[PDB]
Amino acid sequence: VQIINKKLDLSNVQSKCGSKDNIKHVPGGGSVQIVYKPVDLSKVTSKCGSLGNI
Amino acid sequence: VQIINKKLDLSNVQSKCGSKDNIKHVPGGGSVQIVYKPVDLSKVTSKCGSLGNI
Amino acid sequence: VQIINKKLDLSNVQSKCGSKDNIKHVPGGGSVQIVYKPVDLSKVTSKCGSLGNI
């Protein structure tokens, strides 16, 4: 009943950001979820001289 | 009944930011969750001379 | 019934930030969670000459 994963990871990231989730994973009936007036206004600048493998 | 993972990781990150989640994992019926006036005005600047393997 | 992990990790991080989660893992029905006026205002700067393996 063998399971064999053998994973190899060489990945690279310059800047990595997690989630910014407002309401998340709320199991139950008759519950109330309100998200009111969100504003994403954020800025991302990425500049690179050469991107990719080989 | 073997399980064999054998994982290898050489990965790189220059800056790593976790999540910023407002309401998260709230198990139960009849509950109230409110998230009122969120703003995200964050800035992310990434600059690189060469990004990638080999 | 072998479980065998064999994991090897050589990964690198220059700067690492944990999560900034407001309300998190709150078990119970009929409960109330309010998050009011969040502001992400953060700045992240990453500059590199060469990022990646070999």
Side-chain angles (χ1 to χ4, degrees):
Chain A
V1 195
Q2 292 86 330
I3 302 181
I4 304 181
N5 289 20
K6 290 263 285 183
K7 180 173 179 179
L8 173 55
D9 182 357
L10 311 191
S11 57
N12 310 293
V13 185
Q14 191 170 30
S15 56
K16 199 182 189 294
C17 177
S19 58
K20 309 191 188 186
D21 298 337
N22 303 130
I23 303 178
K24 176 174 184 167
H25 297 296
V26 186
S31 65
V32 181
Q33 293 78 36
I34 306 181
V35 176
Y36 188 17
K37 314 193 179 187
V39 180
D40 187 345
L41 213 70
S42 61
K43 304 198 296 183
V44 183
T45 296
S46 278
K47 298 190 291 184
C48 197
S50 180
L51 173 57
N53 306 293
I54 323 302
Chain B
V1 193
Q2 297 88 328
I3 301 177
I4 303 179
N5 290 22
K6 284 273 288 181
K7 180 173 176 179
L8 171 58
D9 180 353
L10 311 192
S11 59
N12 305 289
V13 187
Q14 192 173 30
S15 57
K16 198 181 186 293
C17 174
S19 61
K20 309 189 190 184
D21 300 338
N22 305 125
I23 303 178
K24 176 173 181 169
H25 295 296
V26 186
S31 65
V32 184
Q33 292 77 31
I34 303 178
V35 179
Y36 185 19
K37 315 197 181 185
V39 179
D40 176 8
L41 176 49
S42 58
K43 303 199 301 186
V44 181
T45 297
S46 275
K47 302 191 292 183
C48 200
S50 179
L51 172 54
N53 307 290
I54 326 304
Chain C
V1 194
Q2 293 86 329
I3 302 183
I4 302 180
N5 288 20
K6 290 270 287 181
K7 179 176 176 181
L8 175 57
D9 180 356
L10 314 192
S11 60
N12 307 291
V13 186
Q14 184 169 42
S15 58
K16 198 180 188 293
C17 175
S19 65
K20 308 190 188 186
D21 301 330
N22 302 129
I23 303 181
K24 173 175 181 173
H25 296 292
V26 188
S31 65
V32 182
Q33 296 77 31
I34 307 182
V35 175
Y36 187 16
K37 314 191 180 186
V39 181
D40 185 352
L41 211 75
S42 60
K43 302 195 295 182
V44 183
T45 296
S46 278
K47 299 187 290 185
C48 201
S50 180
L51 174 56
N53 306 289
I54 323 302

